[PDB]
């Protein structure tokens, strides 16, 4: 019956939809993969600063989080979270840069709470390369550096990293894009 033809047509469209989602997801897997890093250093490239900043003000998107980077092929999983228009004591005045401990497939083998030194920083695309950066030491008692429960613990870093005045009136922004860099000290943990 023509109704049976439609039953099959409907089934294919549904399948085609699954395939579309499925395909798109892999696209994200590819990106994450193509942008990964396993030496505890992450260089995050943020394009469309102007737009994204505006979306942060209007409240469409308060923060962006980077792709995950690792301290080693099988160590801590981490990433960065930024608020182009500020968070906490920086909302409206600064750009807040936070570090994020994510749940990793090998957390049952890694030390806790997380204690590696973290250096946060914004690259200076200018010619003098005056990179802006800070370095903290995880707070053992903080819930941001304890063995993960969900996908990622509560971000933690510098709410008052850079003054929006400084950033935008300098050579940190070129081609409508800035680069953020994080450096985890892999110096301590593992290795026979």
């Amino acid at each position: 019956n023509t109704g049976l033809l439609e039953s099959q047509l409907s089934r294919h469209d549904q399948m085609l939809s699954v395939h579309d989602i499925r395909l798109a997801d892999m696209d994200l897997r590819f990106q994450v993969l193509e942008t990964a890093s396993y030496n505890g250093v992450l260089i995050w490239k943020i394009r469309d600063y102007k737009r994204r900043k505006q979306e942060a003000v209007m409240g469409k998107t308060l923060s962006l989080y980077s792709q995950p980077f690792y301290t080693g092929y099988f160590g801590y999983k981490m990433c960065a979270r930024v608020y182009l228009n500020g968070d906490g004591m920086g909302k409206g005045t600064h750009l807040s840069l936070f570090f994020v401990i994510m749940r990793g497939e090998y957390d049952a083998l890694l030390p806790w709470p997380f204690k590696q030194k973290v250096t946060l920083m914004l690259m200076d695309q200018g010619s003098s390369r005056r990179h802006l950066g800070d370095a903290f030491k995880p707070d053992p008692n903080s819930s941001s550096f304890k063995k993960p429960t969900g996908e990622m613990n509560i971000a933690s870093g510098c709410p008052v990293f850079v003054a929006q005045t400084v950033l935008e009136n300098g050579t940190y922004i070129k081609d409508d894009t800035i680069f953020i860099k994080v450096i985890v000290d892999t110096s301590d943990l593992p290795d026979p």
């Binding site: 994200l28 971000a155 709410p159």
Partner: peptide, 18 residues
């Protein structure tokens, strides 16, 4: 050298970006 949490640990206004 002491990490300050993140207040927005309450709102879910965030976008993936690799």
């Amino acid at each position: 050298s002491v990490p300050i949490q993140c207040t927005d640990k309450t709102d879910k206004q965030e976008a993936l970006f690799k």
